[PDB]
Amino acid sequence: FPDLLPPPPQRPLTLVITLEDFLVHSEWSQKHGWRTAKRPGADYFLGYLSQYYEIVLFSSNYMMYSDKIAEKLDPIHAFVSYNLFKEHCVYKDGVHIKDLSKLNRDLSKVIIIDTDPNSYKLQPENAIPMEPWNGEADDKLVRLIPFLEYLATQQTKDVRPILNSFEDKKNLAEEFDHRVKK
């Protein structure tokens, strides 16, 4: 399998985020066909965090299906460094996986945020799992920012010891809030 990204150009950390059920959510109908909603805070999340992270938007769908959705999130291409798709996943024991060791990045400096435990199966130590977004307006993206800002503003040398210090990474933003007095 090919390496997927050029060598770093620069930001101290790389943030790999899934598209489907994290930034957007799609539903099909007879009346309208496929329709896609954008989560509250998505534009701000990408715009603000791009100042601290190299952002890689890693879609779980084939390019032909999600290419345009991804583009709408950053039409002028100012925030997202790279777009990857299902074609870039490796296929192992019948599941597709976002193999971070193919990103040509130091894995002490990579975070992946995904909603499908298969996607981070090869690097669970780099992962922040998220409950899939259902399309209902919520503030979960905004709540994730303080931890991500913290990682970037403290260095950080290796994100993994901190990431894996939580009781339940699915509840990371809330636990981090209780751990820190701003």
Neighbour count for residue 70 (Cβ, 10 Å) = 20
User: Which alpha helices (H) appear in the chain, and where do they start and end?
Assistant: 42-49, 63-72, 140-153, 160-163, 172-179
Question: Could you say which residues in the range 153-182 bind Ca ion, by CB under 5 A?
Answer: 177, 180
Nearer to Ca ion among residue 37 and residue 145 (C-beta): 145
- 24 in a known ligand binding site: no
Please work out the total of residues on this chain that contact Ca ion, with binding judged by CB under 5 A.
2
- 16 in a known ligand binding site: no
Nearer to Ca ion among residue 120 and residue 147 (C-beta): 147
- What is the sign, positive or negative, of the torsion defined by CA atoms of 77, 109, 150, 84? positive
Q: Residue 120 and residue 17: Cα distance in Å, rounded? A: 11
Closest residue to bound Ca ion by CB? 177
CB of 145 to Ca ion, least distance (A): 11
Count the alpha carbons within 13 Å of 149 in the hemisphere toward its beta carbon: 13
Question: Could you say which residues in the range 12-41 bind Ca ion, by CB under 5 A?
Answer: none
Nearer to Ca ion among residue 85 and residue 147 (C-beta): 147
Residues that bind Ca ion (CB under 5 A): 177, 180
Binding residues for Ca(2+): 177, 180
